[PDB]
């Protein structure tokens, strides 16, 4: 579903 | 250290 799609594309953004 | 500083400021970016 759409929920699983957004979780799959996650990245870790910092400085 | 600088490593721990960057690790503390991390956020979860997706779509």
């Amino acid at each position, epitope marked *: 579903t759409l929920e699983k799609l957004m979780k799959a*594309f996650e990245s870790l953004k910092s400085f | 250290t600088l490593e721990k500083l960057m690790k503390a400021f991390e956020s979860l970016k997706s779509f």
Partner: antibody, heavy 115, light 110 residues
């Protein structure tokens, strides 16, 4: 020296299997989600699959779901694509692309499925 | 048939401006502000020109600009020159995953 480099491509038969590797260098692989995008000869780009920064969440396109398996090993800085039950339509150049913007691509690797 | 629709080819004289359109639908380009543009040379890796409709990565020339109206996104190249002759793809976001256009071949006349 920031780059992605695919490998493992080659020529295979329909129903056969193949395993693509993607070596990342020059950045923190662990922090970015990674994708596979493919391009048939003389055709447009097609998104195949994506996996999270920590490999916990994956998502596949309807055209490869149940046949392709995406995975990653952050400790060796590598993205993988296990391709099973290959079809002729799967014939394409396969790229790995970083993050949701696809802001970094590799040179690609050839996968040809024929008899 | 490609998910997003782009013109097959666009030609332009050096110095001029050309616009590459990309028509999607209600549920992608219209629904989200998540359209991207890529430049691809033959046998080379695609290159991100613009993300989030109008935002440009640091090392990308300001001759490239992106906009969006309704279900259609647009890429504009101004001060057109030889090195701009390439394939250009637009990408959007959708409930089932990122979609791509068929790509547009840009020809500069010289």
């Amino acid at each position: 020296q920031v780059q992605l480099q695919e490998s493992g491509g080659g020529l295979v038969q329909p129903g056969g299997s193949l395993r693509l590797s993607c070596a990342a260098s020059g950045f923190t692989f662990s922090s970015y989600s990674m994708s596979w995008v493919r391009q048939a000869p003389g055709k447009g780009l097609e998104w195949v699959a994506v996996i999270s920064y920590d490999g916990s969440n994956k998502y596949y396109a309807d055209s490869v779901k149940g046949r392709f398996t995406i995975s990653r090993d952050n400790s060796k800085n590598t993205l993988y694509l296990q391709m099973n039950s290959l079809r002729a339509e799967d014939t394409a150049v396969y790229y790995c692309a970083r993050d949701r913007y696809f802001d970094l691509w590799g040179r690609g690797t050839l996968v040809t499925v024929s008899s | 048939q490609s998910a997003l629709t782009q013109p097959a080819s666009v030609s332009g004289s050096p110095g001029q401006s050309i616009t590459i359109s990309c028509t999607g639908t209600s549920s992608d380009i219209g629904a989200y502000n998540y359209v991207s543009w890529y430049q691809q040379y033959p046998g080379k890796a695609p290159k991100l020109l613009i993300y989030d409709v109008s935002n440009r990565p640091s090392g990308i020339s300001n001759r490239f600009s992106g906009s969006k109206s309704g279900d259609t996104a647009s890429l504009t190249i101004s001060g057109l020159q030889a090195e701009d002759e390439a394939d250009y793809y637009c990408s959007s976001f959708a409930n089932s995953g990122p979609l791509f256009g068929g790509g547009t071949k840009v020809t500069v006349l010289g």
